[PDB]
Structure 1
């Protein structure tokens, strides 16, 4: 409620794609997640759905944010606040509003919030090659994603005042828990193309086939019916969280550049440590002594971003994101200056 003015201002237009997430970071003194989380969850009326008090929610957001490492250049609570913001923006789209159910929305906003909790600023490959405790605990399989989901539930249900799921019916909770877990696990990149291709094959292609019959009222129900199956809602949710997770290149140029700097430094640090410990270098190209951040971003965009957002845009209609992506791609291209 009574939020210090500067923070209240930094959160004024959070429903718009162009949002100064870094001013939120500065204003909140590296606590953007609890503040943006509170406003978003309220706007979506989540406790009124889970039957929790703003007090229980505040405690929950506090312990989650506290478990995001501020020392990480990229994977700190600001990244999650940002992903939370993109998630809300997507949930607010007509196509998504008329396809997903309130419980899916709840799962999505919560998944975004916790999807990277306690991230160590190192990739799964690093943890595995290092024989890290987490890698041994998760048998070198989806190591970090499994950890993010697991730790989040441990912190949530391990203390009564943090458990935002306390007042739920076992069944509804079970359904919500499975949905949250699925979205968090869907952020593991090794499965990137699998998730994207399934979205294209089960959603965009079939839908395009139906949108030929015309705007028949009897045709709409056919579409509405097809896109609302539990299977497709799951694929849509997976696509939604994945796109929110790597939406940096679709942000206003100033922000896009800052995110590239942050993730680059995080990757550079890992490379320096790998060569030090003698561990195998998993990201040979990501060395601070030889890597061009602009060329790397261009490759990243061309390899993953372009096709995934093409499909997401085709399904949801996201002209703002696509225009920024083009402008940003051009910006990186324009830096060659040689």
Structure 2
């Protein structure tokens, strides 16, 4: 379609992992999700599955991207575009093609687009302690994560032109709705170790056991049967959206550092607001006046990222991501210089 040249060049090598998302951000004028969305939805053929026009998809991507806050350093349209790029990369790998169905691919790419819609640059704990409208609305239980999915479906189905699910069947939409909701809710922080351990115990450990008896067609069909079940497909979806969300430590060094600055700046603004209003300081280490960003990223990678992407790597085979992870980890160590 008639896209401008810089934005067209910015989306040149979108199938590759090494991708300049900030050049696309700069080119699109903080509209990376609509341009990258139209291409990624067309490549997979999502409107052919959903039975929507291109005009419906443009209106859908605009109203959602509009509700992403530009004022937030990290949690904005450019993050979800990078998370959409991470999702599309994992779907394009052979393990995920063989395992997941086309309905899961549509559920994954839609979930990534909406997963932080109307993020206020503030955590769940902030809104619970502050007594926010959403914290009261969702009863201190997945305050942001429930609001993201809910508002997304309010904006989609509430308007006629925005609704991309209008021509679906009753059964197909119900499954896809439950798929997207689950993947959006899976990104909440407190269920990290629940969703990671389930992926190890139900997929990786059984798959490691099944690999002992050669590479026979009888054993390969049992691996095909075991992975493709509805329960295991859900656990892969929960793991894929979680890895796609926090893929920034496994990006190229230039992009990794930029994501680290934005998330840190966002937490410093929260900590300044927590002290000013007199709220309890839930994230004490993330203060601009005391935080070491290199050391904090090392702590962040060790706690959450290292074990998660190790499990995800064994399943999918991601030598580029783990090579970047090692390169970025060694960089943060090198910045001490004392």
Q: Same fold (TM over 0.5)?
A: yes
The alpha carbon displacement at 1:96 in A equals 0.2
The alpha carbon displacement at 1:169 in A equals 0.4
The CA deviation string for residues 262-307 of structure 1, in whole angstroms up to 9 with x for no partner, is 0000000000000110000000100000000000000000001000
The CA deviation string for residues 89-139 of structure 1, in whole angstroms up to 9 with x for no partner, is 000000000000000000000000000000000000000000000000000
Q: Distance in 2 between matches of 1:73 and 1:175?
A: 34
1:196 to 2:196 alignment: yes
Q: Distance in 1 between matches of 2:226 and 2:35?
A: 37
The CA deviation string for residues 25-81 of structure 1, in whole angstroms up to 9 with x for no partner, is 000000000000000000000000000000000000000000000000000000000
Q: Distance in 2 between matches of 1:125 and 1:213?
A: 48
Q: Distance in 2 between matches of 1:286 and 1:212?
A: 46
**Paired residue total:** 338
3-state SS in 2 of match to 1:323: helix
Q: TM-score, normalised by structure 2?
A: 1.00
Residue equivalent to 1:231 = 231
Moved over 4 A (4+): none
The alpha carbon displacement at 1:174 in A equals 0.2
The alpha carbon displacement at 1:142 in A equals 0.4
Q: Distance in 2 between matches of 1:81 and 1:171?
A: 29
Unaligned runs of 5+ in 1: none
Q: Distance in 2 between matches of 1:211 and 1:189?
A: 32
Unaligned runs of 5+ in 2: none
Q: CA RMSD in A?
A: 0.3
Q: Distance in 2 between matches of 1:237 and 1:263?
A: 24
The alpha carbon displacement at 1:236 in A equals 0.2
Residue equivalent to 2:104 = 104
The alpha carbon displacement at 1:11 in A equals 0.3
3-state SS in 2 of match to 1:74: coil
Q: Distance in 1 between matches of 2:285 and 2:279?
A: 15
Q: TM-score, normalised by structure 1?
A: 1.00
Q: Distance in 1 between matches of 2:112 and 2:202?
A: 24
Q: Distance in 2 between matches of 1:15 and 1:29?
A: 22
Residue equivalent to 1:21 = 21
Residue equivalent to 1:85 = 85
Q: Distance in 1 between matches of 2:141 and 2:238?
A: 19
The alpha carbon displacement at 1:204 in A equals 0.2
3-state SS in 1 of match to 2:99: coil
The CA deviation string for residues 171-199 of structure 1, in whole angstroms up to 9 with x for no partner, is 10000000000000000011000000000
The alpha carbon displacement at 1:335 in A equals 0.3
